[PDB]
Each structure stands twice: as structure tokens, then as C-alpha cells.
From Swiss-Prot, chains A, B:
Quaternary structure, from the entry: Homooctamer.
Keyword line: DNA-binding, Repressor, Transcription, Transcription regulation
Taxonomy, superkingdom: Bacteria
Role: Negative regulator of the dra-nupC-pdp operon. DeoR binds cooperatively to the operator DNA, which consists of a palindrome and a direct repeat sequence located 3' to the palindrome.
Recorded family membership: Belongs to the SorC transcriptional regulatory family.
Protein name: Deoxyribonucleoside regulator
Misc. comment: Deoxyribose-5-phosphate is most likely the effector that modulates binding of DeoR to DNA.
Species, as recorded: Bacillus subtilis (strain 168)
Gene Ontology biological process terms, A to Z: regulation of DNA-templated transcription initiation
Length: 254, 254
């Protein structure tokens, strides 16, 4: 693959500011993850500058990126959480450590979002987001000029299907209609929010706000995530894509 | 000091199930803290048994106890957070790590309380506590038969006075009337909640619920905490006290 050329195709196809088509020797998930994670860290290091407000998220890919981060002597940087929290899982989300590592690399301390990912009732979610203290955190998430995230998939094993937040109807709807999530907000193959009812009781950065950011950075790859990435990029939620060449070719071939 | 006799005085004076008066060679805060932390971990190890629900909290003493924890082959144990979260501080609270270390030592995974310590409005706090998912976490906190905490003080330094949660009037009230906090709930020298108005918009285990537990364990010491410990014990919020022999003598002397 001509990574430059292949990046150009993606930039044209989805209207990206930048598409970084990273060499990975093989197409298996772990290798792709290792290479994108390393590339991600360097990019963040190159890109982050005095005064930036950096919105981050949590998940296995994000954690690996965080671990790879190298210290950078920058000032006035804030690092804020964009994704809500869960109350229990058998696997550690490493959410705290992830934002800690990011914060430390940029000479600041985490701005946490101390809320659950979902409320049972949208009226409660709305009054929580209007809490004077919470609103400031959400506002910092909007002000963020860099946002860093991966996409999740809609497999049976997905975390968010396994936490009691959704009844039979809701899980079936998401499995049928959604291709993935950004920060726990589920979208379809055209980038549309699948269920406004569900999304209206979910906490985290609003997907439409991502489109406004100077750099909205999606790091993702693996055949498992092709539909998800396509949906996210069709919805135009990222302007910078970090992706390996196997996945990048899979996206073009349709 | 005769530790056993001095423990007996404390058990009678405050009506404690157990008073563990721990030897520390000096009245130095750090030294007291190191010895109490170690004794704490040992006690927790001895005490925790198959099927216990353990309520923990976060802070520097708690973090230290968690670090000293040794693995225990126990089963069916749940470990749950009793103390709400903050959104930022310049010092890491180690809240995540603290509850992780406790959970791992007891062969389980943390049950987080993904909420802020304070809401601006009590009607919002109440609606959040009644959220179906949140209510289960609070219920687990109530069901907990072991609770582990220290007391905080009311000095100008105190975290909770520096986070925007309280206006001038409220900070002055707590400074004048409170002697300390347990899990961010402020009480006076007689153990009474200082401000029901503030307390009604604060998240975390309710102090009155601590009195019902099989073991409500207070680890605390240092001349800085004499008034705080006295208030907490006068309110009878702990039935097990882990304290060094300097502080313990200071309590008897009034």
C-alpha cells in the first residue's frame, strides 16, 4: 500500500482534514492496536500545545495510547473526560489511569466527569447536566479543541449491552440499527443517532459537538470495526483519522 | 501506656465494640499514619470473610491502608464506594486505585459510586439517589456489614472548602460549627450533622447508617484530629476504633 495515496482517498471520501494511514505488518487486532496506539501517542505529543483543552475518553485502545504517552513540557493545558462512568465491570476500564496518564504527560491534572453513563430517566439526566458544577465540566468538554477517541462496536459482548441500562426492546433496537458508539452514543451506518430516546438519557460529549473541534481524532482499526468506523466517518464526527492500511483499504473497497 | 487498659477506657467512654490502641513510637502525624495504616490492613485481612460487603472511602490514610493490603483468599466479597467523587484537585485523591486495591485483595472488582460529592440543589441530589441504577449502589452501601473510613478535619486546607461547592455563608458555618467529616458529611462536637441543608445535597453513605453496621471502623490519629475523632465517636458512627496511643491519651484527658 501507498500510505500517502491511501490517506488521500480517505480524506476525499469522508472529507477528513487528515488521514494518517499507519503501516501495520499484519491485519490481526492486537498488532493493529499496538501500532495505532503508538502512532496515536506521537501525534498527540506533536499536536498538543500551550493552552489546549484536550478531551479524552476511556477504553482499551485509549488506555494503551495513554500508557505510550511521553511527557511534553507544555503550559496551560487542561485534560477533560468526555465519556461517562460505569459502576461495575469484571474488567477494569482503566478510565482513571487513562486520564491521569494523559494529564500527567501534559503537566496538568484530570478533569473528571463524575457521572454514570446512563440515567434511567431523561428528565433526571437533564437536571444533572444543568447542575452548576456539572455544567462547567460539560462546557470544558465543548471548549476542548482536541478530542481523542476510538469507536466501539455493537457485538453481543459490548460492555454497554451488559450493564442493565437497557431493556429487551432497547438492546434489540441498538443491535439491529446501530453500527457503533462514540463515547457511549450509538449511531447507524449513516452517522445518525439510532435512538434519540436512549441518547437523551445518556451522559457524555454530544456527537454533534465533536464536528466543531479543531481536531477531532478517531484512532481505530481492525476488520471488526469497519462498519463502525464507516458510520462514524459518514457522520463526520472526526476530522483526523488514525488507521492502519488493512482497515483503510477495507473502507475504500466498498 | 498500657495499650489494653487504655483501649478499655476508650471502649467505656464511647461505647465501642473494640478499641485497638496501636503503638507508635512518636506523636508525629506521618508515623502515626504509617502504623495505623499497617494495623488497619492487618485488621481488614483478619476480619474480612466469605460473603462480606465492604464499604470503603477515599483519602490519603485510606490509600495507604489499601497499598498495605495483602491478598486474602476469600469468596463472594463485594467492595463498594461510600464516598462521592470530585471533579478536579491538584493532588490525586487515588480514589480509583484505593478501591481497586481493596477489591483485588478480596478477589473481586470495585463497585464505584459514579457521582459528585455535592449537587448545587437538594431536589437534584434526591432525584439522582432515586435513579434505579444509583439506588442499587446506595443500597449496597447500606447493606455493607463492614465500613472503613477515617475522619477529615475543618482546617482552611480541607479539600471540601476549596472546590466551589460552598458559598461564603456555608463555609463560615462549617468552619464555626463542624469539627470534622466522615465521607464528606460534616458533624459537630456532639456528633450532630452541622447543616441539614448542606447535608441534604451531599452524596455518600448517610452517617446514621454507619451505626447499624457490624463493623464500622474508624482509623484515625494525630493531634490534628483529636476534636474530629471525639465528635465522630460521640456521634457513635464507629464501633471499632484504630488509634495510636498518643491520640488515645489525648481523648481521655478531656
Amino acid at each position: 500500500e501507498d500510505l500517502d495515496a491511501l490517506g488521500s482517498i480517505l480524506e476525499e471520501k469522508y472529507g477528513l482534514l487528515e488521514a494518517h494511514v499507519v503501516f501495520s505488518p499484519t491485519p490481526d487486532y492486537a498488532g493493529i492496536t499496538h501500532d495505532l496506539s503508538r502512532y496515536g501517542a506521537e501525534y498527540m505529543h506533536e499536536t498538543v500545545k500551550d493552552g489546549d483543552i484536550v478531551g479524552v475518553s476511556w477504553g482499551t485502545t485509549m488506555y494503551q495510547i495513554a500508557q505510550n504517552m511521553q511527557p511534553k513540557q507544555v503550559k496551560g493545558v487542561e485534560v477533560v473526560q468526555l465519556k461517562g462512568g460505569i459502576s461495575h465491570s469484571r474488567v477494569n476500564t482503566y478510565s482513571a489511569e487513562t486520564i491521569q496518564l494523559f494529564a500527567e504527560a501534559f503537566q496538568t491534572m484530570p478533569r473528571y466527569l463524575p457521572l454514570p453513563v446512563v440515567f434511567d430517566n431523561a428528565d433526571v439526566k437533564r437536571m444533572v447536566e444543568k447542575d452548576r458544577h456539572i455544567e462547567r465540566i460539560i462546557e470544558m468538554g465543548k471548549q476542548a479543541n482536541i478530542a481523542l477517541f476510538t469507536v466501539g462496536t455493537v457485538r453481543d459482548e459490548a460492555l454497554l449491552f451488559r450493564l442493565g441500562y437497557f431493556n429487551e426492546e432497547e438492546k434489540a433496537l441498538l443491535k439491529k440499527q446501530a453500527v457503533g458508539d462514540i463515547c457511549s452514543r450509538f449511531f447507524d451506518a449513516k452517522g445518525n443517532i439510532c435512538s434519540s430516546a436512549i441518547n437523551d438519557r445518556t451522559i457524555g460529549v454530544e456527537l454533534q459537538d465533536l464536528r466543531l473541534k479543531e481536531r477531532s481524532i478517531l484512532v481505530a482499526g481492525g476488520s471488526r470495526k469497519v462498519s463502525s468506523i464507516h458510520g462514524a466517518l459518514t457522520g463526520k464526527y472526526a476530522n483526523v483519522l488514525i488507521i492502519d492500511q488493512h482497515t483503510a483499504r477495507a473502507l475504500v473497497n466498498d
